[PDB]
Amino acid sequence: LLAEPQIAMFCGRLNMHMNVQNGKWDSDPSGTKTCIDTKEGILQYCQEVYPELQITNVVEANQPVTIQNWCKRGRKQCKTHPHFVIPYRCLVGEFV
């Protein structure tokens, strides 16, 4: 069983996303994406980290989540300090 696709942001640190395979929060694959302020940008990011999941929409999660290991550019200096944020669920779409 897989975890739910979602992304989490904390300005000043690279974006985090849910590794559906192991349920852990992983840092930005390219090591360059940080917090986004538009819904459209968030949807694009979901599509960027979950390229084959047909993500067509996004919505704020119901519960805040504490996440450790936030990194800075290049996925470097990943401190283990915890920061909790409200993640954005990446919603799979059904094409007709």
> Domain spans of the chain?
1-96
DSSP 44: H
* 57 annotated as belonging to a binding site for a ligand: no
* 74 annotated as belonging to a binding site for a ligand: yes
**Resolution value, angstrom units:** 1.8
Residue 31 has φ and ψ, to the nearest 5°, of 75, 20
In the chain the beta strands, taken as DSSP E runs, fall at: 6-8, 16-18, 25-27, 55-60, 65-67, 70-72, 76-79, 83-85, 88-92
- Cα separation, 42 vs 35, in Å, equals 9
Candidate CATH numbers 1.10.1060.10, 2.40.50.840, 2.30.33.40, 3.90.570.10; the one for domain 1-96:
3.90.570.10
**CA-to-CA separations, 39 to 9, 11, 24, 92, 93, in angstroms, rounded:** 13, 16, 24, 15, 16
* 72 annotated as belonging to a binding site for a ligand: yes
* 35 annotated as belonging to a binding site for a ligand: no
Method: X-ray
Report the C-alpha dihedral over residues 84, 39, 92, 62, rounded to 10 degrees: 40
* 22 annotated as belonging to a binding site for a ligand: no
